Amino acid sequence: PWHHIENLDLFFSRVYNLHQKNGFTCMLIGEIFELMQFLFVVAFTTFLVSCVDYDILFANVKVTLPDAFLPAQVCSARIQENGSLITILVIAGVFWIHRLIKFIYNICCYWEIHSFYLHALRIPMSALPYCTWQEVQARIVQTQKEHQICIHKRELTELDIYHRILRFQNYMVALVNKSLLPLRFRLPGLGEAVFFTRGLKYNFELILFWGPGSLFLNEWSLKAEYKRGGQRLELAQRLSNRILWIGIANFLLCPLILIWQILYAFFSYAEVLKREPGALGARCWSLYGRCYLRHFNELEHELQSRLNRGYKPASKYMNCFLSPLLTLLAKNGAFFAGSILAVLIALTIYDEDVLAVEHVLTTVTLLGVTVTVCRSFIPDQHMVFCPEQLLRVILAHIHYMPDHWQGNAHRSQTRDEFAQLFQYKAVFILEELLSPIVTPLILIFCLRPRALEIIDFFRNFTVEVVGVGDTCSFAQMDVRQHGHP
Amino acid sequence: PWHHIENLDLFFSRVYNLHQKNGFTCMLIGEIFELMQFLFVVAFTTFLVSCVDYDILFANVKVTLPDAFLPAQVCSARIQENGSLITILVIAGVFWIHRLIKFIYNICCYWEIHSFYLHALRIPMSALPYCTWQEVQARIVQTQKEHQICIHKRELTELDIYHRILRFQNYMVALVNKSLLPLRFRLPGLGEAVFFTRGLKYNFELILFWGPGSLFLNEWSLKAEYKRGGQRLELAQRLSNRILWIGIANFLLCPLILIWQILYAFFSYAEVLKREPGALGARCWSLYGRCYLRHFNELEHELQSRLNRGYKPASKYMNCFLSPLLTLLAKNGAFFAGSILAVLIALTIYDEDVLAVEHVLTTVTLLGVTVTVCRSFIPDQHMVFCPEQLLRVILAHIHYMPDHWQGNAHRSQTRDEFAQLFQYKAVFILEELLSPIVTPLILIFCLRPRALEIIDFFRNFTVEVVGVGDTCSFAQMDVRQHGHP
Amino acid sequence: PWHHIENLDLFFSRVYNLHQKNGFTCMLIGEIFELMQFLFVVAFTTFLVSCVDYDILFANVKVTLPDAFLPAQVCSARIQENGSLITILVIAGVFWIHRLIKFIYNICCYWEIHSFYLHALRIPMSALPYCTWQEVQARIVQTQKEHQICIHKRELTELDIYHRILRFQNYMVALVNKSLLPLRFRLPGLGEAVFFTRGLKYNFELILFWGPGSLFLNEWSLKAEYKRGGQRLELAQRLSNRILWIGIANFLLCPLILIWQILYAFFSYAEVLKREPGALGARCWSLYGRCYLRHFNELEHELQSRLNRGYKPASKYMNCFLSPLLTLLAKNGAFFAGSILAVLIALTIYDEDVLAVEHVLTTVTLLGVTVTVCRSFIPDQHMVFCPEQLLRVILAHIHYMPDHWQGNAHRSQTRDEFAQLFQYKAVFILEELLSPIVTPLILIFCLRPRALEIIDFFRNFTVEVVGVGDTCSFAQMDVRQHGHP
Question: Are A237 and A376 in the same domain?
Fold first, then answer.
């Protein structure tokens, strides 16, 4: 039944994604819960805005919650009489309906892959979370004569399945590393800033690869017109017009995307401001660092393995760089906040009728939050500074470092060059909130002029590997600093 | 004064236990506090049930606590008029009185050992917590001509004191490792389950060793009738009748034991559900793992040393096994709980009169507990998976591993075989609560049929070591998987 | 402009202190904030004592905070009518004014050093927090012909700048290590106790070095009269009179210093009793251990580097010493506290009207604090005891250990000898609170009799190093136990 599927790219992508998302049933439940998350966010925001009154809740017998909830008829009438909200409601509803249709289609598309796993591979769906991709790939390449997927080419190879899965990720890595994309700017106040978000990456990929009129004809061969040099200026102008149209669309959807981002961030990151307020001072590998430390023909889990093995030294290194003014401010703010909080707590203990005072409880809560977040920037008074033996054990994992880092690891030049590869979680959240605003700007003013050189790139950096199609060249550039398998 | 004590087993057991429980005064205070714990639990439960009224406490001038407490006369009358409670009260009172009598007797029994330490050993009672059992045993064997405990045999030896202390623990280890005890079952829903609790072990030991009519005549020689083969069926039938009677007694005491277990668990494990709600997700060496990883002639602290040195790798290993469905459920439950909790907290901060609403405070508390327990099952996003180099450093400590573990450490066959040696703290608590119920069942239906083979064992697996008595054979079986000193 | 400054001691001290306190602006802001801390403490205590009434706050419409605050006119009248408070107010005001004058003077004194850094060294004030003292000292010694600070001697050397910076710290180390200072006592109840506080060290230094009539003439040469032996008894009697006068002054200022210490400790250590109540069970290197493990000619950061590298093993070692009675008391107190707290929490959850009871909330808070501080003394049930391989890795860092420590590290003789070098944070706080009381006593009865031998020391333990002046002898004594570079 798996003879000449003729979409081996998407087939292998799905075969790999079903192994990553452990099990067909677990993937199904994950997508069900993600649909439920969106539905819950939208419904709960609508409820809070319309039904609840906040007049008899803020107190201006005990007041019970069903007192504040208006009856369903008048709440629905108030929803209807809004308009400005009823527009966003239909927009979100049609988006959710489209998502549900896609999920219904993918259900069968992935049940096919489940059957392929069960029969052609003899791998039970209970032994997937305890099997490795090396074994799955070895079985696929061993049984390649029985299930008979690709005998058009002579045989199937691990290099062929790699090229099939990572065909567009190799192109994105080559672009980002050859600096053919507008992701660096000079900001008065900070200077050099690398701005690379999920929205920007999605837009770049949608402009270049996906779509009916993109650079790639079907899914494994870019249109022949892009392999010649005569029509260079035509191709550049066409790409510029496409980029302009997509940037205009991004600007049109800006309020919707911004509202969704704000709501999701407040729902998914505001309980941490009490449960663990120091969790936003930590760091994570930036979306630029992921595309910068990535080899050619390297799977997502193979990259995450290194980015996990090299995380604790990368936190120790970035903690060995004390900020003096920040430490001073933290110490003094903590002292003042704790000195007020101790008096409040002693008064409350001696007599609790002081909790009924108008603002004492909220004051105490906010002062506790303040002292707990200020105590998070004070480094431990006893930590060993060895910033040279830390890079030697980071470079052993991330495999890529600029040449001017091994000699001088203590300078304030490496720390801010490395901070683009290892950014604050709060900076990630911030630059994700600013994305719906500043994504069209980069997609109109900063990407459209470059539209020429990109089309030069795709013309002279594409190899026709037999049995696979058009892939990106690896050994041609080799101008990534270190280089390592 | 220590000439021919004639109970060297119990004497050496006490000499070792006084070294373990550091100091005579510390052991005395420990037993005083354990008596006080039992008294407090019983008295506090009786108080909460009888005196307090909960009508004028639940509010249906400020209400003060002495308002709820009924006067002593009417509370005592209400205690008296119960009956169903006054029976449990006399039962608990006579149990506590018996315990106090035993403690009074042991006071003098251990002051004798304190004097033996002070005089015959020249070890002050202030240098015990800083002395090792190797030194204590060396001193005992060196001064064995002055204090003159055992010159009936030619000399005293460390092997002799080992055999004297661990005479019954060697038998229990041999039984559990030769599978002559009913501790494994097939449960529809889980499959193979190892059920071994303190109640079961105590009952096994009370059936076999302790008692007037048990297998052992005095304390170091089993009755001669058990060394012959003629009366095999008589001995088996007698053992079966004894097991039946003791299992019937266990079933008769079931409600008392169950009530005590419930009360003690609620008193000693319910503050952790707020103080550290993730502490029940941790793991501990099961009572089966203790008897499985135990050598022959190995003291309790010598076993605990290994079980402590091999605890961190044994936690890392069992954490390297992700549960996909559990992680999905945890992530989604945490998202929903935190999204509701953030709205509640923001409302409370903006205006605190919303805390007077009927259910807001208990809602907030339960939602915080929910999000904090759900966040405990989400593994850290950055952890290295190396499940082969972890068994190599566990086996170096626990010294015992089945043969079919070194080859395949990532399978879902080893993880659930190892989870019988390293169980959840919550599973320990659960199977301890079910013990008063399901202990007689195993003691009537599952142990009574085996009563034949046990008596075969004791007949052909007992060695008469001169100067010590009847001990268990070590080199006869040697069918524990790895083997190591 | 830096030709023959003629106060090279203070000049180099300031050059080093500006490198340590990272940057001129950061040092300025630190001193501003320390002045503000003192002002805030004093003003807030005065406010709490005078303005607030606590009658309409303790409740004997909602009560708002501006209701409790008396109007400024009557609060100022109440401040004026006190007297006993208005005296302390003028004392604190003149102290703060003197501190502000000193700060104004030091502003210019350190702007001079900032200019010296910028011009004579070519080290920008933005590259200081990322430069090392080795590089700063190398630059100072390299450019020593251009800026022309000291060509009176032949050349400048790193040994010369070391001797210039640490001239008095070497003397203090020699005294403390030769036991010419009264810092050890026999206390009935504890026995040998080492009492060394910041007040005692400041008084010792003010008696010996600083001042107009101290032992040192200007700043690098002790008066010639102290280099002869004829006037020994005169010099001893003069030193005794000076010590007596300074001890009398210390006793006169005792209530002021004690009030300040109490207020500062309550303001800076009472929020930790809720934020992290186990933080006072930790340990820190005592002020005696600092002067005991210190080499000759070793800077403060060079000492702190070792005391930081040898902190985790020094905590593991002092945790490998179990206190049996303390562990028993902790376990039992935690059990009882948690058993009461669980009942209170279950009642609150089932019905929240029980929070309005007169003492339930403060009871719950104090019981939570009790159980959380008791749970802090219970050691982790799984920790490896290897107290011999810990001293081998501590001595590698602290470089100094008595001879009778390597053989027997498990005894209860080393643990209490090492506990004078590594003390509880709470013991530090306590012995700092008792300092204003017991500092004059040691300065009248215990230091005044020794005044003879000290003057012997300074007479026969001073070397005239050319180009530097009078320094302390190093190789003369060499009776510190281990010895290491």
Answer: no
∠A64-A70-A73 over CA atoms, to 5°? 145
How close is the nearest chain A Cα to the Cα of B262, in Å?
31
Same domain, A203 and A183: yes
C15 occurs within a structural domain:
yes
Residues A323/A329, Cβ–Cβ less than 8 Å: no
Q: For chain C, say whether B210 makes contact (Cβ under 8 Å).
A: no
Of A341, A378, A335, A324, the closest CA to residue C39 belongs to: A335
Contact assessment for residue B259 and residue B281, using Cβ atoms and an 8 Å cutoff: no
Q: What span, in angstroms and rounded, lies between the C-alpha atoms of B71 and C66?
A: 44
- Claim to verify: residue B160 and residue B171 sit in the same structural domain: no
Task: State both tokens at B136.
Answer: 């204590």
Secondary structure element (H or E) that encloses residue C464, with its range = strand C462-465
In a domain? residue B190: yes
Nearest Cα to B149, choosing from B20, B299, B7, B14?
B7
In a domain, B485, yes or no: no
What residue in A sits closest to C263 (Cα-Cα)? A339
Task: Name the residue among C158, C169, C163 with its Cα closest to residue C133.
Answer: C158
Tell me: do B217 and B249 sit in the same domain. Answer: yes
A vs C, Cβ pairs < 8 A, gives 96
Partner A contacted by C271 (CB < 8 A): yes
Question: What is the domain extent for residue B247?
Answer: 166-270+433-480
State whether B368 and A275 contact (CB < 8 Å). Answer: yes
- CB atoms < 10 A from the CB of C242, how many? 18
Kindly identify which residue of chain B lies nearest to residue C322, measuring between CA atoms.
B129
C56, part of any domain: yes
Chain A residues whose beta carbon lies within 8 Å of the beta carbon of residue C39: none
Asked if A256 and A314 sit in the same domain, the reply is: no
* Experimental technique behind these coordinates: cryo-EM
| 8 A C-beta contact, residue A220 and residue A9 | yes
Measured between CB atoms, which of B30, B37, B309 is closest to C384? B309
Residues A146 and A73 in one domain: yes
Looking at this protein, which amino acid is placed at residue C42? V
Read off the tokens for C132: 């090392």
Residues of C in contact with A373 (CB under 8 A): none
CA-based nearest distance C420→chain B, Å:
19
The H or E element that residue C108 is part of is helix C84-120
- Chain B residue with minimum CA distance to A352: B62
Q: Of the candidates C6, C279, C10, which has an alpha carbon nearest to the alpha carbon of residue C153?
A: C6
8 A C-beta contact, residue C317 and residue B20:
no
Same domain? For B264 and B275 the reply is: no
d(CA A354, CA A350): 9
What spatial distance separates the first Cα and last Cα of chain A, rounded to whole Å? 37
Contact A30 B328 (CB under 8 A): yes
Q: Which residues of chain A lie closer than 8 angstroms to B412, CB-CB?
A: 126-127, 129-130
Q: Are residues B59 and B148 in the same domain?
A: yes
When divided into structural domains, chain C yields a total of 1
Closest residue, chain B, to A304 (C-alpha): B382
DSSP characters over C204-261: HHHHHTSSSSSSBSSSS-B-GGGG-STTHHHHHHHHHHHHHHHHHHHHHTHHHHHHHH
Any A CB within 8 A of B122 CB = no
Q: Bridge-partner residues for B423, per DSSP?
A: B284
Q: Are A301 and A134 in contact (CB under 8 A)?
A: no
